[model samples]
Structures are given as C-alpha cells and as structure tokens.
Target chain A: NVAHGLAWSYYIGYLRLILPGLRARIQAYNQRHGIGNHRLHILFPLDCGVPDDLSVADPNIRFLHELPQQSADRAGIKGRVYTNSIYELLENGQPAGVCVLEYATPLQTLFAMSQDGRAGFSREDRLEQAKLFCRTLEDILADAPEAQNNCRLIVYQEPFSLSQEILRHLRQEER
Target chain B: FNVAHGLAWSYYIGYLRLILPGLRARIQAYNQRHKNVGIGNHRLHILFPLDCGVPDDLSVADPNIRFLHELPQQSADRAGIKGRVYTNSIYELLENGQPAGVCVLEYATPLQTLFAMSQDGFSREDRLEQAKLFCRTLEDILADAPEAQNNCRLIVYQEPFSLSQEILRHLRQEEREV
Candidate 1:
C-alpha cells in the first residue's frame, strides 16, 4: 500500500490518524481477547533540518544547540512519554498544544545511534537496521510495563509528535 | 623560509589556515544578515511560489514534506509520504545571493549507506553521477543568480583538481611583508 510507498520507508503515521478513534475499540478488543493493552511499535521518518556538525555553527544556520551535536537526542521516551513544542510557524503566535509520539525502549539505549547523513536516511532497505528497531520494540513489549500502565505512552501529541519521527530513524541505527 | 623539502606543504596549509578563518567568518556573517533577504522558497512551495524565486521544490519547508521520485515531472505527484513533524530548533538556512570567492562546504553524507554508488577508476563521473541531483538543483540556483557569470572563475572538476599551488603563489607575497 502507499504506507510503504517510498524506498526504504515503513511509515506507521497511518496509526496516529486512526488510533484516537480505534483506541477504545482496541482497548475493549484487547481486554476481552486477552491481547493486553494496545501496545504499538510504530516506525516513521522525519528530518530535523539541523546538522550535527560544524554546519550547526554556521551563522546562516541556527540550531537548538550552539555547540556541535554529533547525533540526534531530542526528547526521548521518559515515563514512557516524550513531549515537545508545537510544530507550526510562530508568525501570529505559537500554536497551542504539544506534539507527541510513543517509544518502546529506555531513552538511553534508544538514542545512541550515529546518524548517517541523508534527507531522512538512505533508501537501501537495510534489514539489520529494521531488525534493530524491531528487536527493541520486542524488548519493550517483553517488559510488560502494566506496572507502568498500557506501557501506555501518549507523549504529548499521541500521533502528531515530532520526536517519534526522529526516534523512528534513530532507532533503526546505532553507533 | 625554504626547507626545500616536503615540509613546505605544512606552511601552505598554515597560510590558508591564517587566511581562511577570517574569510569564512565574513562569508558566514554575510549569510546571516542576508539569509532572509530573498527567501523565495526557504521552506515553501506555493502555487505562486509565495514571494520567492527558484521558488519551487528546490527548497521547501518540511514537517509535512513529501516527494515522489522517478515519476514523470508532468504530474503534480502527491504519491510519496506525507505527515507531521514536531522537531525543535530547526528550519533552514539560505544564502542571500550566490556567494563569491568561496568554497562550498557540504557535510559528507554518512558513510557507506545502503545504496552506495560504486566509484570505479573514475570517481569524478561517479561523483558527477552522485551529483546528478546536485546539477539539476544548481541549475535552478544558477538561474536565480545575477549577471555574475561574466566574472572569471577558477572552476574545475574532480580528479582534474586539488587545493592547488594557486593559493601558495597567491599568499607567497605576504610571506615577505615589511
């Protein structure tokens, strides 16, 4: 389907658009069927536009960090949640509400990947990278964090978060 | 000032190091003040291209960014991925005019990506093939450029070039200053 349309892409943004409506259904379905909380391991992609190099210091470029950022480490899943400011232009005023996404691993191991420079990443379909991401999600599900709730992660914007986009690519890679 | 040996290359790199930081600083300063001067499409792809030129997809604001590769240019293809992004401390940087007396510094793409293009004996053509996207984009940038092509340029291509002796000679005079 168009979900996997682009080369080297496995987008789950389709999840967010449906989850709000489907979530209750999922809850009931899982509750009755012994499937457990609606645990999801989504994968998507985004470009933060800031480089992690000398280019960050280019006066033409303004980055979140004034120093060189060797890799991506925005917000990560903490309390099984990640949050950030809204993703709209600040012309009239900042947009209300935060952007949110879910994650599956501890934030430390979650964010330790070296970035290969591409608009998002290469379209080569490196299955090892895919497995890396999948394994971590598999690990999180194994944790069965009902001790933490649905292992429930509704960062700031359940489906509209930017950090998840960043995480999707970062998790697919490593140092 | 002559070791008369291979050691002289160090002096040359040193000379450029002396001259480069100041020049690089000024180039950055100019890019800073003038970056927003003509943001024709800093991150926009409007029907009228908003208030910019070279205003098409050459550089568009992302977040909801999408592109469809290999389709015929005739169709306004919306077949690629499209969705939301909520990144922090991010947007884009543009140059005011075509910069002058400078070297373009591109961060090396992360190494050995999956679709690694092969570079046989001819890295230039391979590099040129890699730059296939670069040429088309630069063509649009050149189109937006002023009447400055008349200005002489030291342009050359890969393997047919180096950080040549031209600079050593250019800076050799200052080595004898009063």
Candidate 2:
C-alpha cells in the first residue's frame, strides 16, 4: 500500500516543477527552516475541505508538503514531509533548470505548519502568502522571455480515476 | 536498472495488450466475467441486521434503517478513520429484533477508484460504464442516508471504496453537453 501511496504522489501533480533558480529558493528555504538538504520540505495546500472554496483562502484546508521519510513516519503529514524529487534538467552536461515535485496519499489531510507553531495563518493570511509567492514567480518568469508565455496552472487534465495520464507525462520527460 | 525494469514493465503492460489481443482478450473477458458474477469484482459488503424478518431488499423507506451521522466515539470504523470522517456508523439497520448490518457507507477517491476499472487495456467504454455504476451506487447510498447531509462530509477513505471517477466525467459531460 505504501508503494501505491508513493506511486499516487507521482501520478498526481504533487511533484514539483523545477525552473531556473528554483533550487536556490529551495536551498534558501531549507536554511531558513534550519533543515539540511535532506530535511527540507515545502508546504502547499491541495485539498482545503471547504465548500465552494477552491482558492488558497480556505480555513478548512489540508496542506501537502515534502518531508524526510522518517519524519513523515513520526509526524505523518502534520509534523514533516518529503519530496520525491528535486529534478534538475541538464543541458550539455551543465544544469539548465530545476523544479520541485512530490506525491502523497489522498487521506493524509494535513495542515500547513510554521516554525513557531503559532504561525498558523487564517484563511486570508494563507491567500496573501500564496499571492506574494505568485508575484515572485511572475518576476522570475519575466526575467526569461524565451520561456513559454502561456504557462498553465497545471491542473489534472483527466479524471482522477484516469490519472494514468501522469505516466504519459513521465514518458515525455524522458524525451 | 530500476528505470530499465520499469520501462520494461511498462512496455509489457501497455504494448503487449495491443500486440497480442487473444491473450489480452482472455484476461479482459475473465475480468469482466468475474465482475459480472461478483467474484473478483470489488464490492462493499453492506450488511443490514434483521430486526424483523429481512425485507425483500433493504430500501431507504424502511423505518428501521437509520444512518449513523457521526463515527462511533470508541472503535475505528472500517479503515480506521483515515482523512476526515465523511460517513460514519451513527445508526444501524435492525432486523428480526437484532442488529444485522449497520448503516455504514464506504467511499473512495477517484484516483483510488480507478483500481476498480477494467484490467484489460482496450475497453474504455466498458470501464467507464463500470465507473458510472460505482458512481450511481455512491449517489444512491448518499440519497438513502438523509442524515449524511447533516454531517456534510463525503467519506473519502473506506479501505477499498473510492469515489467513482466515471461520475465526475458524467457530470462534466452533462455540464458541457450543449
């Protein structure tokens, strides 16, 4: 079942997307959290468990995160998390881009955490956090005009049951 | 090496189905036959305790049947209360003055629900039909349990039961069927 769980993460968009400089942000976040490379994780909301609220502004939200396996075991989704990969696409034997991604169980409905535990934000606060992050992403994309102008929000194209499509994406990555 | 093995496995699972339809057809037929007979097919065994003589079949109109709105305060129901408690055992279906099958509903998410789909590679429509039936069953279960509305949660994890993806697709199709 853990294999299924692991595979489920890969099948879902829980995997991270690596852009240029994305690795540096991950590294910086890790250092800020006092976690080494192996101990690092990034938290984001997936299912907010709220009625008619798909935006980041849902208090009744369950967060997803990447964590160390051992930590995931101890705290489950609440205490710690891990990423399946921090993939770096190389060109000419050199790093050209990077991204983060992961997968997890559908039932691991965990809430996001902060260092001081007191940092749990209200629904609006979390939305603010996400909005600021989006601005940062826009800035990053702005620096590279050559990148595709039409970036998708990256939602599931098929019904969750037919998510074998993720396998197709995996194959495309090889090419 | 694992990647190579995975690639190999993928080829075996994906390609061989097309190249050797006879072999694949046998597997698919067997899967469908098992499904039709409820042998290998996935099922949620809903039991109704006969408080009275067991009726022809359990129906929503039965007065004795009651839906358990909240999970039992003590024991872990079915799959040990994973995710959020959507539909829990708050009531029981009494039969013959005895507890038979409690009014328990099991639900699974769409992704996990795919496990119930056809094993054979070609019958997308048949698989979709199966998925649709699964969806209908879930809807029927919810409609039967009026108390679930008070609970306002759809059970997302019940060991083997998952939300039928066919239903979502059907709903979307209905939405876009202009």
Candidate 3:
C-alpha cells in the first residue's frame, strides 16, 4: 500500500550521500577499539510514531533523529542536526560537492492524495538526488565490497559532534 | 507516469461523453424507483443538507436534495444560512411544486478530481459511462428545482479534489494557489 520502490531508492540515496564521511569516522572509531572493518558500528534514525525498539520492518529506512545522549559510550564518530542542511559529498577525504533538496506536501483535498504525491515525488528530481547520493557512495567504496578494501563505515545520526567523543570513550573501554 | 497521464486525459474525455447518456438513464430509473412514493403532485421537496454523513445519522432538516459529499468539514461547516438555491431545472418545481436547492460543499481543484478519477481506477470507457449516468441524475434534480439558483455557489475545497494536474499546469497554478 506504500511506495515501497520509491522509499527504497530514497533511503539508498540518503545512505550513499553520507557513506564517505561516515566511512572515515568509522576507521577512526575502530582505531580506538583496536578493531577492523568487520566491527564497524552503525545507527539509524526511526520515523516519528515508531517504537524505538521495534524491529525495523524494512531495511530501507535510516537517518536517526539524533545520536543517543550516551554517544560518548560508543566507539565511533557522531553527528547531529536539528534540521537537514544542504548535504555535502567528500572527495579524497575532503568536501567535494554539496546540494540542497527539500520535500513538501500540500494540504489541499481532505480525503485524497495528489497524483504527484502518490508518484513519490517528481521522477526527474528524485532521480537526480539518487544519482548524486549513489555517486558519493561509490567514492567511498571505490567499487569494492570487501570490508578491508572498503573504508570502515560507521553511520550515525543527529546530535553529532559526539563522534570524537565516542572515539575517546572507546579508547577508555567505555563503549 | 507520462503514459498514465495521457491515458487519464483520454479516459476523462470518454467519461464525459458517456455521462451525458448514462445520466439520462439513471434519472429515468430514479423516477421509476421513487414514483412508488406517490407524492401525487404533493411537490417533492429536494432536501440537501451540508454536513458530512455519519454512519447512522439521517436528518430531514435539509430539504435540498442536491448534495455534494467528500467536502472538507471546514467548508461544509461554514455553509452560510441554509436556504434554497436556484438552477436551470426550475421546470420541475413549476410543474410538480417540488422545492429544490443545492448544498455545494467546496471548490474541487483539478488535482483532486484527477485523484478521485484514478482512485476509481475506471477504464476510459467505464468512466465515461459512469459519468454519463451521474450527469443525468444531477440534471434531473436540477430540472425539478431550477428556482433555488443562488445557493449554487462554486464550492471550493482543499487539495486532491482539485480539477486535474494537466488543467492546473496550463493555468500556471501551484499547489497552494489552486
């Protein structure tokens, strides 16, 4: 009953956009743990109205609302946001590109969804967003799937700026 | 999506055509169904109330039978001073002494209309036939109570019921403007 395909592509794009930066922070995370790529930690955001401990029904959903308050107890970098800013992509471990995208829903009819809304957003813009995100992820993967070859990737959510704190705590064995 | 768009348009046109004739048939049918009521020229008062229907709340307060459903609770709630509306169908009132009025709920945008059409998932031909029958019923109602015209203000509602995406685009309108 939901736009499964659209949602999947959207989530994939979201992950791809941040994969590069996240992968770097993950390596730093593992350093404190004396671990390697296989042990990377990831956190995903839940949608409003979902129970926190509920097993995610779909693998596509991501983007945590914020890092846990005890993020300093984790073994990775952290990031947080009150709102989404224009997302940036990394190149060779530095900012390479950025884009601004926003979504909006109109409250017109009382008991109906717009043809466009049902379409899961305009195809053109959606495709562009997906493409950018995928391209950025490829930068981190460099076409490799092997964990050792791939950058250690630790994905996180809002209440960032705790990534370094997590790393420090991990070194103290507080994770 | 483009293919679907083209098809929707073609289907709508076909629907309009079928509604013309289908409506005629439905009116004839309704007359037959209600003819048994035997008002005997007692003048059937068309009752059209504004509120959305509840599961089990039927009220005789509205005498105007021209009712539009699926309107926003807001607009329906604000329908100014309940009264009779005039229309081109006054011939019925004159001939049968029937009181007529319309309870227009809201102005449906093109998008809203398109969405409704899609929801029905009617084929081009089926929609046309359906629309034709519906039009007939509406026409017959108007014919009966043509005098209550003032109550027929162009009803405006929120999104989804907007006319259609194509028409709205041509008008250079955005989501909110409609």
Candidate 4:
C-alpha cells in the first residue's frame, strides 16, 4: 500500500502531463469532495526573529501593502487570496524592520497544502512560481534602507483561518 | 484600472467561487481594489507556533512564534485542538521561499508538508533526519489525543527535493547587495 501510494502519485503526475486542464479538474473534484476548501489556512511571517524589526515608519516593508498593485501582478501571482497585516519588530524602542503576516483563504490554503496533487496542481511548479514572487519581494526588501542580513521570511499554516487570532495578538501587543 | 489586471482578478476570484459556494457571498462582499475581504462565513482561529529546533518532541523553539507547555484546552482559545509548529523546514523558505516548511496540527489530518528547492546547504541527506525528527515530534504531540491514533505520516511530494536555479540567482543577488 505504501508503494501503491507513491505509484499512484507518479501515475497522476503522468496524467497531468498528458491532459490539459487536468490540474483544474482535479482541484474542482477535490473541492467538491471536501478534500480541499476554505477551512485550511497558510501564514507567512516575513523578516521574523531578525534583530531589525519591521515597522510602518520603514519605507522598505510598507511597500508590501501596495505590492499586489505594483509588481506581484507582473509576477503572475494569481489564484491566491491573502490579507497582509503588521507585527512590530522593535529594537531599543525603535522600529527595526517590518514583520509581515500573510493570511491565505481556504482556496489559496488548499492550493498550498495540496501542492503534491492534493489540489490537482504540481507543488513543484507552484513552488517555482512562489520563488519568482519571493524574488520580487526580496528585491524590494533588499533595496530598503535596513540591512538585508536582518531580514527573515517564515511561512506557516493552520487548520483554520488565523485572521481573528492575528487581530487578537495585534491587540495584545497594542496593550 | 488596468483592464487586464481587473480581468485577471475576476477570473481568479470567479474560479474560487466555482470551487466553493460558501465563499461566494464573502468574496463578493470583499473590496475589489485591495483584494482584501472581511471574515464572514469563515471564522478565523489563531495558530500557535510550535517548537522548531528542539532535540525532543516536547519543546518548540520558533523565533517568531511561541508555544505554551499548557494543555490543549489552554491554547484552544487561540487556534484549534492541534498545536501548530515549524520544523527546520528552513529549506522551504530559502529559495524565493520554496519548501517553506510543514504544518501538523491545523488540519483534520495530523501532518501536512510543504517543500522548497535549492542547492547550497539543503541536500537531501542533510534534511532526511530533520524530516524524521519533525515527524517524531508530531507523533509525540498527538500521543495523548484520542482523535489522533494514527502514527506520524507525512503527506509530502515524492522526490520533494530538487535544485532551484532561481535560488542560486537570488543568493548571488543577495551577495552583491552586501
């Protein structure tokens, strides 16, 4: 059965190669079967743990808010849904770099969790796409005034959306 | 408004609705310009960061996120019954954030894996034990939970290792920046 699982994976991989739109079909089937949906969550904590915390005062990280309009569109960042918010990385009472939290919707979450055909798409290909987008994000961050070495990018996910939890943490930080 | 851009967003959002009707009302209510939407049908849960580089399964050491030694009920208010954590899945975040990492606690299933590809330090043998330890910790965390009887199994891609030329380029770019 274990070998069968791997064989099944290769078999599907072959089908995907020969069949056009097979990826979308697989995604649709999975979603209908409740195998994939909006319940899954993915989080990205960028520039985390670095000494230089990110802040709104910093020009480098602030531009991330406008990235969808600026360059993500150029990199072909589609089929993903997210909400960007702040996590203040402070050093000596001053802003270091910005801590970015990207919360993905269920479909986007499914896209990520099932990168290995759980969503009917190639996780390998999608990763290549993510790398391209990450390069653009890294480029923008590198150009910022803060030292690039202090930058950290962390990606994570959960069973459910953390939008409310993130808001809760932000509130706790405010207090 | 860039017609092409608007069209792309439309296609993407429209495609999501085709997969999920539950998202239709909420996505439609969302602001088109920001691609930002409010949480309506979907209620959000907080993900507590699990231990990263601990020798055993009990401790979680994530720099950005933290976990508590308290019971599942103690943290239930934040995320879910399962405790979420990060492994040295450092490979996932390296090349344009490729492998990213793995998530064990959030889904109905016990463990879910993410991948990243790059050269340099992330050769397959180097990560094999890290991957093993990761599964061990997950198994330990869920050891007490009755809902989680299955052993730690990773649902990852078959040859989840590869080289990212993009990462090489990105690393070179970073070197030049310095």
Give each prediction's DockQ, rounded to 2 decimals: 0.02, 0.02, 0.01, 0.02
> Judged by lDDT against the true structure, how good is candidate 1?
0.23
Tens digit of per-residue lDDT, candidate 2, span A44-80: 2233221211112322222233322221111001112
Tens-place lDDT per residue, model 1, B1-178, is: 0111111111112112222334333334444655332212111111111111111231232212222111111111011111112111112222232211122211111111111222213243343443333323333333443322111121223222112222222223323435
Interface RMSD (Cα, Å) for model 4: 19.8
Candidate 3 global TM-score: 0.18
The global C-alpha lDDT for each of the candidates, from Candidate 1 onward, is 0.23, 0.28, 0.25, 0.26
Which 10 consecutive positions of candidate 3 chain A have the poorest summed lDDT?
A68-77
State interface RMSD in Å for all models: 21.6, 17.2, 23.5, 19.8
Question: What's the DockQ of model 1?
Answer: 0.02
Writing each residue's lDDT as its tens digit, candidate 1 over A10-113 gives 11112222334433544444354322223332222221121222112222211121111112221110111112111111112332211121232211111221
Task: Give lDDT tens digits, candidate 3, residues B1-178.
Answer: 1122222222222222222323333334444554331212211122111111111111121222222221111100001111111111111111122422212121111222222333444454443343333334334433443332212222222222212222223222322343
Clash tally for model 4:
17
- Candidate 2 - CAPRI tier? incorrect
Candidate 4, residues B1-178, lDDT tens digits: the string is: 0111111222222222232233233333432322211212121111211211112121121222222111111110111102111111011112343433211112111111101111214344433433444344433433542332221222222231232332233333433554
- Best prediction by lDDT: 2
Docking class of 4: incorrect
Candidate 1 segments exceeding 4 Å error = A1-175, B1-116, B119-127, B145-154, B160-162, B165-178
Q: Locate the minimum summed-lDDT window of 10 residues in model 2 chain B.
A: B73-82
Error of 3 at B85 (Å): 55
